[PDB]
Design a protein around this ligand. Structure first.
Ligand code: MMA
Ligand code: MMA
Ligand code: MMA
Ligand code: FUC
Ligand code: CA
Ligand code: CA
Ligand code: CA
Ligand code: CA
Ligand code: CA
Ligand code: CA
Ligand code: CA
Ligand code: CA
Lengths: 114, 114, 114, 114
């Protein structure tokens, strides 16, 4: 099943934050309406924030997260959770190797802001 | 129902990260085994990452999040999600006022690390 | 925070199913646009399905679950989960007593159908 | 990533419930410790409960859901969500074709019971 793709309300600002837990350098791309809107890279085995940004979901609301390590696409897991019918999380884990911890890059998207 | 209380794996490192989306200055307290282990604070209406820290869940694994604004406790919502039976997120929203956006302080706990 | 309230896409069919795990008879009311659209009741300590039905979310998409036992509303917990950006679950637990297992009536709403 | 595999607490009763939304007849097999413990089959495009049963997670706590149509395995998605640190839902969707609604068989596992 496709993972790392989310439909947000149109024209809405959202936060995106990435963490690293891996020997490999993680590259996280965030695409809005199929175009790159943010890119974070970094290396940590201690959950360091490797980037945070606020983006607008645009006319389509389509947001996609991709993760790669030295060009090799990571396998992704994802889901969206909504609390009290108001607060949205779109969550992504990724695996760059064999241990299947799926934390090598972790991406959190949250909305609404403000 | 009680919110913002999570049972983590014992003796295990986790990340805790807080975001602010409010006019009021937020204070987030993270308790491990009923003792304050981290405090974050800030003021942003644009998702500032007011704190992020790696903690150990200790012998009992009990982790609790509390949020206050100028000394008044905020109302909390929370849940835990698990992806691919391995990757864990404990999620907290909080409301300091009347609009019920529940994003005034947002806290994400993630494990495992490394 | 309010619990058991969900915004579905407008005019969309959804499933609603309730289970019982308690000594007392559970009455589950499902409201669409703030009117009772279905009512289920039954008693089980073994997760019996006490009702299942297909409903339409109507013009507003507003769906609410309420649970009553022994003449009093139960305390509710809830969340919505979306898998692969397609499959939606709106989940409700409820507590009628003192043990805080929150399973006394469990309600599952799922969409889309077909 | 692997989907449809959950680790439950050992020796614990849980509910498993399957729904169908597809032209193809769905077959759902629920494995406990790698042996089939329940099986449900049926065709519906209206969310029929093609089966619901109480099982015991046994010594291993390993529960796996498989879905097929006339022997052809469906693609699975899944996640687990925990409410108020107490109430567990393990969720499965499945896709037997090309439209990616992932609702062709939907399986919900809930615990604890009683
Ligand atoms: C050496 O192990 C670490 O690094 C690899 C490669 O980045 C990760 O897959 C793994 O989960 C660990 O974080
Ligand atoms: C002025 O409104 C903003 O600030 C208040 C007080 O902090 C929040 O409750 C609200 O959601 C907005 O973020
Ligand atoms: C005809 O379309 C229906 O049946 C196919 C095959 O079962 C499903 O994949 C699809 O989602 C619809 O439910
Ligand atoms: C048999 C018992 O019945 C009620 O007291 C419930 O609140 C308990 O959770 C338990 O199910
Ligand atoms: Ca890894
Ligand atoms: Ca890792
Ligand atoms: Ca607010
Ligand atoms: Ca706010
Ligand atoms: Ca109870
Ligand atoms: Ca009960
Ligand atoms: Ca399908
Ligand atoms: Ca279908």
């Amino acid at each position: 099943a496709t993972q790392g793709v989310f439909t947000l309300p149109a024209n809405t600002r959202f936060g995106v934050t990435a963490f690293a837990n891996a020997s490999g350098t993680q590259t996280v791309n965030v695409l809005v309406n199929n175009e790159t809107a943010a890119t974070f890279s970094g290396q940590s085995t201690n959950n360091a924030v490797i980037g945070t940004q606020v983006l607008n979901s645009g006319s389509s609301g389509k947001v996609q997260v991709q993760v790669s390590v030295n060009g090799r696409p990571s396998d992704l897991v994802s889901a969206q959770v909504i609390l009290t019918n108001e607060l949205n999380f779109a969550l992504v884990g990724s695996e760059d190797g064999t241990d299947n911890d799926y934390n090598d890059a972790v991406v959190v998207i949250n909305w609404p802001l403000g």
